[PDB]
Amino acid sequence: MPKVKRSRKAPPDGWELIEPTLDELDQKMREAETEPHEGKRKVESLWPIFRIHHQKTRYIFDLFYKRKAISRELYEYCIKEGYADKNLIAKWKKQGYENLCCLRCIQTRDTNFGTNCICRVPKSKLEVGRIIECTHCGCRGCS
RNA sequence: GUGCUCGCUUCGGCAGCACAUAUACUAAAAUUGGAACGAUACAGAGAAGAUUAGCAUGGCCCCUGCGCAAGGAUGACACGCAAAUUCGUGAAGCGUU
Numbered sequence: 184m185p186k187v188k189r190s191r192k193a194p195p196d197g198w199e200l201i202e203p204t205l206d207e208l209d210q211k212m213r214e215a216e217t218e219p220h221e222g223k224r225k226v227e228s229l230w231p232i233f234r235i236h237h238q239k240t241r242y243i244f245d246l247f248y249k250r251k252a253i254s255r256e257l258y259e260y261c262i263k264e265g266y267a268d269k270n271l272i273a274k275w276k277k278q279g280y281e282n283l284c285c286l287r288c289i290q291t292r293d294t295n296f297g298t299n300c301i302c303r304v305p306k307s308k309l310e311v312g313r314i315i316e317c318t319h320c321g322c323r324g325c326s
Numbered sequence: 327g328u329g330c331u332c333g334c335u336u337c338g339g340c341a342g343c344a345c346a347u348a349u350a351c352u353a354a355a356a357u358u359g360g361a362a363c364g365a366u367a368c369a370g371a372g373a374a375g376a377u378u379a380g381c382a383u384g385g386c387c388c389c390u391g392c393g394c395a396a397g398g399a400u401g402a403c404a405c406g407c408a409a410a411u412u413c414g415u416g417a418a419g420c421g422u423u
């Protein structure tokens with residue numbers, strides 16, 4: 184039934200008020216894992232996973248840095264138990280990197296020419312209104 | 327998108343600045359051709375009588391094997407009027423100069 188947790192210590196103080204929605208985000212991830220690929224291209228079928236992973240991480244990020252509604256103990260519990268991404272949070276604290284979808288979309292080893300994805304280009308600098316879905320992510324303009 | 331703006335200046339909008347700077351064999355396709363060693367009919371082991379161990383040779387024939395081992399019927403093929411340059415003696419008969 185649970186997330187089966189790997190601490191065996193009781194979860195920290197503010198846990199019971201963020202638990203319905205974390206379990207609701209977790210239910211949404213288990214739906215996306217089982218969606219049968221039919222008219223969903225070979226790269227398009229992994230787009231829900233990066234989106235919900237972004238969503239869970241942004242949820243804990245919004246409660247600890249913006250709303251300030253979680254202590255260090257509860258926050259680091261959620262990172263250890265796999266509800267947030269420590270590395271994606273770490274990029275959102277950088278200056279320009281603040282709606283970043285994926286860690287793939289800034290990885291320069293993953294591209295042909297050693298560069299980011301066009302996901303990361305500012306939308307003013309494309310100048311035309313071309314519509315873009317990043318192949319890694321499905322993103323339409325982080326930046 | 328975020329933040330700083332002793333920016334207009336409200337907490338609404340806009341202005342400037344800074345940071346952030348180019349994914350993808352681009353398909354969820356449309357097409358396009360070639361193969362298998364299975365049946366189904368005909369077919370039956372090389373060495374000058376017969377029964378036969380084999381080891382090679384050669385390459386527009388390959389198979390099993392990691393193999394520069396070893397096997398595959400000695401793995402198979404090989405069975406061919408197998409003619410390559412280059413001529414002359416002697417006698418006789420007929421016609422001709």
Ligand SMILES: [Mg+2]
Nearest residue numbers: 396397400401
């Ligand atoms: Mg042999």
Ligand SMILES: [Mg+2]
Nearest residue numbers: 379380399400
């Ligand atoms: Mg024999």
Ligand SMILES: [Mg+2]
Nearest residue numbers: 382400401402
């Ligand atoms: Mg042989």
Ligand SMILES: [Zn+2]
Nearest residue numbers: 288300302317
């Ligand atoms: Zn991207």
Ligand SMILES: [Zn+2]
Nearest residue numbers: 284285288320
């Ligand atoms: Zn992404």
Ligand SMILES: [Zn+2]
Nearest residue numbers: 284302322325
């Ligand atoms: Zn993106």
